[PDB]
RNA sequence: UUGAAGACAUUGUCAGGUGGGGAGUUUGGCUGGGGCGGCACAUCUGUUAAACGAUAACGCAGAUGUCCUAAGGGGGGCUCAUGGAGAACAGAAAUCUCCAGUAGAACAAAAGGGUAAAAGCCCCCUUGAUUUUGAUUUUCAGUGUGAAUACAAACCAUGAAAGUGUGGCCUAUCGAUCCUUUAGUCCCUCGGAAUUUGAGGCUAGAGGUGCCAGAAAAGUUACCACAGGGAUAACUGGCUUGU
RNA sequence: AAAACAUAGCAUUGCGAUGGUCAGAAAGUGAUGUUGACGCAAUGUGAUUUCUGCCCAGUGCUCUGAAUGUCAAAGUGAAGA
RNA sequence: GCGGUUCUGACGUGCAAAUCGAUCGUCGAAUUUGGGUAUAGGGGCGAAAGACUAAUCGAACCAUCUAGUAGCUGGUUCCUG
């Protein structure tokens with residue numbers, strides 16, 4: 007690892023100091039990791055795709071919607087999560103608008119493993135394009151746990167740009183937890199690139215509206 | 223070219239020339255494969271019997 | 277990351293190969309379009325001549341071998357996926373279970389033109405993709421029930 | 422075959438000599454050094470005229486390798502190696518088998 | 527170097543001996559120099575020699591002889 | 594001397610390409626001649642096999658180069674194939690119930706064996722698929738490899754417990770020397786003396802040889818050569834007489 | 837002794853001399869060459885007559901064709917006592 | 918003169934390690950031939966048969982390395998117990 011933990015700790019401490027003391031805002035600041043890529047031709051190299059779960063939620067209160075059968079709708083209601091059945095999705099006779107509005111309302115979607123096949127037809131490529139295509143859930147899976155996972159999941163996936171931005175934590179989290187999550191996120195990211203540490207051009211940490219800190 | 227593959231013809235005659243010797247028995251066979259826990263104790267027991275006939 | 281380190285190429289005897297099977301020629305996976313066997317001389321040892329079309333490039337490849345010599349055959353997967361989108365160059369596929377593949381690249385010639393015209397109106401296109409030796413490509417598409 | 426990313430097993434380390442939790446990874450060979458004595462000797466032997474001076478294996482038969490696990494003890498950091506049998510597919514902390522489900526179309 | 531003086535680079539043996547280029551004479555250019563001088567003045571005795579110059583094609587020596 | 598040419602080219606050394614023009618060499622085995630085919634070449638089940646063991650043929654019917662974090666380990670609860678008689682839609686076949694049911698089921702994969710408060714089915718907990726080396730059985734030279742058996746010294750799992758567990762109910766599912774590489778001890782050595790890198794050792798693994806006790810290997814010859822073979826084909830003769 | 841080879845005729849290829857083809861261990865060395873495209877060199881077909889179709893995917897040969905794939909030695913940069 | 922078709926003639930321990938007889942091809946030129954001279958062994962020379970290169974050619978002859986190696990063939994010397 008070209009990152010020594012000490013430098014990450016220093017920059018995290020400076021970031022937390024700035025966010026708590028200098029300009030405490032009326033909202034919880036999310037800490038992000040901005041990543042640059044070197045020596046990648048997106049259009050010709052293989053578009054890597056990796057998802058990791060961070061132990062503590064980087065962004066609790068992320069809006070999730072469940073597409074479910076009657077049984078999942080009832081479980082979703084019990085968990086206080088917005089459920090849309092089918093009937094519903096069907097009543098929406100598309101309306102680029104009606105879909106667009108739904109697409110932008112919730113930050114992510116979780117669908118039941120039966121309906122999901124059906125999602126592409128009932129909606130359009132609208133969800134696929136925003137990168138909001140639903141994550142699957144089983145009846146034999148804990149519906150709220152899955153919701154805890156989605157909120158806690160980070161996904162590095164190269165499309166066209168050598169720039170990626172990923173939410174690693176919040177300012178209310180303990181310094182050591184945040185450092186561990188940054189290290190885990192970078193280590194996971196590097197281990198998706200063909201030349202490991204040589205495809206990494208730059209690594210920058212930031213809060214939602216704070217200043218930047220350059221590990222690499 | 224092809225040849226004979228196998229036979230035991232003549233082999234018992236060869237075996238009986240210098241006989242089939244039964245394997246020869248001793249008072250005191252090897253304690254080899256005997257349970258180690260037993261063996262370890264048995265040393266200690268034999269030690270004491272010497273220090274007693276003295 | 278952790279992989280078994282398995283071959284991607286099982287050996288076969290040249291005489292064992294057939295028309296419309298697969299075979300590796302000059303480190304390229306190929307489908308066999310002609311297989312002929314000949315005697316080499318009056319001792320009558322047999323020699324095989326393969327003509328094979330590359331499964332990705334479409335290019336033609338000839339090979340010669342003793343009939344009993346071992347040819348490397350590529351392992352060839354043929355998985356079907358539901359088509360979600362053509363994002364730009366690439367396809368967006370769903371893996372039956374629900375997981376997504378977005379790295380397949382999408383076809384060039386008559387297929388890729390047929391696939392655009394298919395997707396542009398409301399049809400659910402299943403899309404078969406062949407994989408071989410660190411390479412994938414789309415080969416055919418259907419409609420859903 | 423699917424094997425879990427952790428494993429409680431014996432640790433030979435002198436501060437353990439007991440079952441402890443281990444992280445499980447796969448073993449990867451390691452880059453051959455240019456100054457390993459065999460490599461230095463090969464280089465000398467190959468120099469000059471005479472062509473290829475050592476055998477070059479061609480008659481591959483196996484289509485698998487044995488998998489080796491690197492188990493690292495989470496206390497003391499001592500490592501151990503375990504060989505699995507041959508297999509074509511290997512995954513580490515894959516999703517576990519569900520019993521009694523409908524095989525989808 | 528000393529190019530092996532064999533017709534068309536054919537050596538007629540085992541591969542270790544197929545070299546023609548990259549072979550080198552076991553005496554120095556200095557020794558060749560003394561020897562060729564020695565033959566031109568066979569009434570003399572070569573005492574010693576020294577380097578004076580070089581270009582890409584030649585080295586130049588002076589050879590001290592005694593009568 | 595006169596034109597051109599000029600620090601280019603030429604020449605020297607090294608480096609990459611090209612190079613049957615040329616050199617050297619190789620181009621398995623078994624086999625009712627050889628070749629083609631096959632694998633009887635490393636193996637496993639049943640039979641041949643003559644009721645200990647051994648036992649041939651290109652004998653017969655088949656199988657092996659995998660597969661499994663459970664399909665391994667422990668415990669619990671339960672009982673299977675099939676048939677009968679009943680229950681809206683529901684029919685030969687959906688799901689529910691009772692009765693009968695010695696296994697006619699299942700036990701990854703061939704075949705054989707084994708198994709019923711289980712070895713089968715479902716559920717709970719787990720990592721004995723671990724550490725240290727010895728002994729033993731099969732194959733056998735009583736070498737190796739593979740596979741397996743019973744203990745010891747540890748440390749664990751499970752269970753109330755007795756116990757059971759050192760991978761898969763048992764019989765197949767696999768690999769030397771040299772080299773590389775990893776783990777271990779953080780130990781020995783670098784020989785004028787030190788320190789630190791590097792290299793070298795010791796113990797245990799992996800990278801593979803399927804011609805499976807393990808060369809690095811394409812043809813042709815009617816232009817042919819030599820050593821031999823009636824251990825072996827192409828006539829006659831002989832046994833046989835299917836045709 | 838032939839139906840084989842040659843042959844005239846036909847066609848293709850290379851080359852303007854700092855050259856093509858070929859020789860030599862090397863050379864201030866040679867053949868073509870006392871030569872110069874109506875020539876020299878390398879191939880195929882085989883008098884005349886008549887004709888000589890289609891295929892450039894393969895192998896080969898060839899190209900003031902794209903470039904940012906692959907890519908030696910030397911050189912360059914960084915890390916390192 | 919040069920050649921060498923057929924008799925598949927003679928001969929076939931010959932006149933002869935290629936001859937003899939008859940029959941036959943060619944006979945003014947891509948003719949036949951003396952002498953001189955050049956080309957030398959992975960070399961030459963070839964109107965091409967792997968032909969010819971001193972009775973030697975799908976790689977001459979001579980000497981040496983060399984008593985080359987042979988899992989293959991042949992032989993291996995007195996008597997009795």
Ligand SMILES: C[C@@H]1C[C@@H]([C@H](O)CC2CC(=O)NC(=O)C2)C(=O)[C@@H](C)C1
Nearest residue numbers: 474475476477478770771772800801
């Ligand atoms: C194929 C590769 C090499 C092979 C081995 O080093 C080849 C050697 C064997 C030997 O003793 N002497 C040699 O000269 C060649 C080995 O062990 C494999 C696992 C890995």
Ligand SMILES: [K+]
Nearest residue numbers: 223224225824
């Ligand atoms: K034989």
Ligand SMILES: [K+]
Nearest residue numbers: 224225226227
């Ligand atoms: K035999």
Ligand SMILES: [K+]
Nearest residue numbers: 537538539543
């Ligand atoms: K020689």
Ligand SMILES: [K+]
Nearest residue numbers: 469470471542
């Ligand atoms: K040499």
Ligand SMILES: [K+]
Nearest residue numbers: 540541542543
């Ligand atoms: K040698």
Ligand SMILES: [K+]
Nearest residue numbers: 600601602603
């Ligand atoms: K120059």
Ligand SMILES: [K+]
Nearest residue numbers: 547610611612
């Ligand atoms: K060269």
Ligand SMILES: [K+]
Nearest residue numbers: 612613614615
């Ligand atoms: K060549």
Ligand SMILES: [K+]
Nearest residue numbers: 624625626627
């Ligand atoms: K035969």
Ligand SMILES: [K+]
Nearest residue numbers: 731732738739
């Ligand atoms: K054994």
Ligand SMILES: [K+]
Nearest residue numbers: 634804805807
């Ligand atoms: K062998």
Ligand SMILES: [K+]
Nearest residue numbers: 619620812813
């Ligand atoms: K040959």
Ligand SMILES: [K+]
Nearest residue numbers: 833834835836
């Ligand atoms: K008859």
Ligand SMILES: [K+]
Nearest residue numbers: 847848880881
């Ligand atoms: K032509």
Ligand SMILES: [K+]
Nearest residue numbers: 891892893894
């Ligand atoms: K063509």
